Assembly symmetry: D2
């Protein structure tokens, strides 16, 4: 009579999967992902750091762009994550197999990564990806140093329990540039109020808005570039319209408050 | 220009996903999966055992058929696996979350289950599923006893390194029935000779043919029923045409030898 | 010349290892550990819950006391933890092997449990125990229900990142009794200020004092009974001198402030 | 009355813990462990390989000897294991935290490593150590190549299910030297016959004797040097009395047959 449905892969907008050549953000920091998914390469004299990798099928493209930058597989030392959803941590397992890279993440992100995004608090098994293990667990405010670039973790739970902003100082034109890679603050299709799987969701989002507002932030980047008004396809003006961290937090909070009101009405 | 491809879910023949009501094999043993994927429920006075669950989307159907048999979620004590591919272990993680069940498997199956079938020796990441942890590691020839039914593991590596046959004795018409749930012996699209990820593949398959030939085997069942000539949709004659274990092993070896010859020619 | 030192097991006060018979706390709640380590059995019509198990060598004693209470290994459904140090989660792995029990814990506790307490933020590898996997990850404020007893998690990070208080309502003399199993608030030998492995340690402890002060709390119990002024060897007056949650929090904060001052002076 | 016993660390002969300076075996291969535990450093132009690390407390000594050889923590690329007992894999977790090293092991060794040697088939929880994750699972006969040195795995189950011999070709005096690092073939205190946790133990040991006898083997090394008649404290004559692989296998089989006969008589 009626068979059970076939499994459905989550399909994304084509721009999320559109390869781009490396785009320089600061002296050591490059966008090497796709037009609409951030994957940041930070290059140091002592090896490279990758912050996010995008979707699972982006692994080979990332390695190609690393090679274009002078980074061989052995040179990739560290993978950091904004959060462990399939569209940001998708290729981590494959990257670990193909490079020297080790993963550092907080406990919440580590457990979600280790189950490949399955049993998501909001999406169930709808967006799974290959599981990976974290090599180092980080705590809030902990620093990790690679070739003299210091990365600081700032927990900003909400979009996932383990959502993290990463900050570091690079240079540009001889002057320091405080880069803030702030995580998503969206809640796409989430039940916000009275969620049995995330009872303090609203409190965590409100704290996370405050955390983002206060980040050291000359340049804001986000996992989805549109969230911070980056346009990676716009070349020399890709970052011209980027939001401040304050503006990003304010916009996210206004959207969140609207969603809460609609949820109450729905 | 050209975006990377969207992820593709592996889609299966519709009969693999066609629910069926429980079909009794022996006094305590029932097929509760789909028309073309085996999932065996063994019911004892001390709880139930599930051998395989089929595809990931079959979890709720399995629980429905268990309930029809008098088995509540708390009553499911043990999940055993033939091998940890998505079409047999697919729903294990969800079943563990929704029942009291613990998983027993050999080390090879446990590591493949824990990575959700990713980095498959032959399929890469093409057939992933939600990862799950094994609660007990079993060795070759080890027995597990549930409510007085004794299950014996017989390793038969090849289709996966961890492929296992499970045997137990049930009853029918007052007489013992030695049931052999023998794993797949297919090698679908595999590189058999000189495979760097499985150097002794051919030797393992040949040993596994010999293991299957020698199993205690009044009734053979297989994860794909067609492999042992079962027809789960045929009601009272579902098992009438079933192969012996000897015939199953011989047929698998003849097919394997043909594949080897074609590989040499290709 | 001089060999490396032998490994040293952490040895504890003998009272921590002194078995005791079950001591009833409320209609369904029993202390079944040792004189100086709490292990709480909550018995319901639908199976039993264990909160903490004490030291690794306590597994058989716990099972003996469960049997004395009418709880067989199959009847133990759930293990909850205060925190995943060796003196409270020590026997969890063995209990999972020997019972039907599944573990529910927050992500921080799950990752520490899965590494058997190794690489502790403060103790390094000095207090390891057999690793175990969590079956369910809980979020702050999440409830788990067993046979109609509702357990609520209240995160109180500090002693470990994953430290949790568990609350439930039992009965006594026909009246509700709100039981609070609050975790340790000690910091034994910890570097409190400027700790690179726990940068927000002090902030987390201060929040945890406030959490404990506000718990629903007719009866306070603690992993080390002396912390809440229980005397499990005192029979019918074991709980007579027990602190309120408010008094426990106040005492812990005063001790913490003294330790901070001594650290500044040392 | 009588408290439960304190945990007992397994204490080893002092020579197992006696540090030694690096002892050269061949052009790229050095013993860097203790007088009575092997830990082999293989140095290549593309990074270093460590085969075994000895006991848990040896991590810092290993890193000191690596530094003496010109190998920094970032230069250690790969850890291979003979088997995952505490006296050979003890420091692996710490080495992974402190170096760039990734672990490659077979599935049996990986699962035992991941539980820190707990629930050992023969020793129970008597010899635990800090758990570690494997980064790569290897199959029998699989090769791993580092800086042009090719390591081949030869499974030799028995002492543990995952016991592995590793072979590679180095040079000495301009000529190839086929090095065989063969695992332990002892069965210390094991129940050999009818062991429910290892039903095919005897068959596996007999196959492993045959595997060892046939290894490519100009120079045999073993995890316990005395098993192959090495004397690491004897300087320029440390390896003079070393057994062939054939002689090692024959001696192990004669000892095994004697143990079997004593077990039958006991
Ligand atoms: C679960 C995954 C597959 C998923 C699916 C679908 C959407 C998202 C978003 C998301 C939501 C809103 C905006 C608009 S905006 C100006 O940024 O508010 C953006 Cl750009 C992205 C995110 C995310 O935020 O990570 N994830 C999604
Ligand atoms: C990786 C998964 C998704 C997959 C995909 C596609 C096919 C299979 C088979 C398979 C092969 C041959 C036969 C014909 S026959 C009379 O049995 O020789 C049968 Cl029925 C099944 C198997 C398996 O054997 O498990 N798995 C497959
Ligand atoms: C790491 C483990 C093995 C360990 C070792 C040693 C001590 C503890 C304590 C601890 C500290 C203070 C008090 C005095 S008091 C009135 O309670 O402030 C108490 Cl009772 C217990 C704890 C703990 O609190 O869990 N753990 C310890
Ligand atoms: C479980 C651990 C802590 C343990 C404890 C105690 C002994 C061993 C041995 C062992 C056995 C026999 C020989 C004598 S001989 C000439 O080699 O036959 C040797 Cl040297 C070593 C081994 C091992 O073989 O790995 N492990 C032991
Ligand atoms: Zn997301
Ligand atoms: Zn996203
Ligand atoms: Zn298969
Ligand atoms: Zn199949
Ligand atoms: Zn503690
Ligand atoms: Zn304690
Ligand atoms: Zn050993
Ligand atoms: Zn040994």
């Amino acid at each position: 009579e009626v068979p059970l449905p076939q499994l459905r892969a989550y399909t994304v907008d084509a721009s999320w999967l559109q390869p781009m050549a490396p785009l320089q953000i600061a002296d050591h920091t490059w966008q090497i992902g796709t037009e609409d998914l951030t994957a940041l390469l930070v290059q140091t004299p002592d090896g490279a750091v990758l912050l996010d990798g995008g979707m699972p099928q982006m692994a080979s493209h990332l390695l190609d762009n690393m090679k274009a930058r002078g980074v061989t597989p052995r040179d990739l030392r560290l993978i950091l994550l904004s959060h462990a959803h399939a569209d940001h941590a998708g290729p981590v397992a494959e990257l670990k197999r193909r490079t020297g890279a080790k993963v550092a993440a907080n406990a919440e992100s580590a457990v979600l990564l280790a189950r490949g995004g399955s049993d998501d608090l909001h999406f169930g098994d709808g967006i799974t990806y290959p599981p990976a293990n974290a090599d180092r667990i980080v705590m809030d405010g902990e620093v990790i140093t690679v070739g003299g670039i210091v990365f600081t973790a700032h927990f900003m739970a909400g979009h996932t329990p383990g959502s993290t902003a990463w900050t570091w100082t690079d240079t540009r034109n001889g002057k320091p540039v405080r880069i803030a890679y702030a995580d998503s603050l969206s809640a796409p299709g989430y039940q916000l109020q009275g969620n049995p799987r995330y009872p303090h969701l609203i409190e965590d989002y409100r704290r996370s808005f405050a955390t983002v507002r206060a980040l050291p932030c000359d340049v804001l980047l986000t996992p989805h570039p549109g969230a911070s008004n980056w346009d990676y396809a716009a070349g020399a003006r890709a970052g011209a319209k980027a939001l401040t961290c304050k503006a990003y937090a304010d916009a996210a909070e206004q959207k969140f408050d609207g969603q809460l009101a609609k949820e109450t009405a729905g």
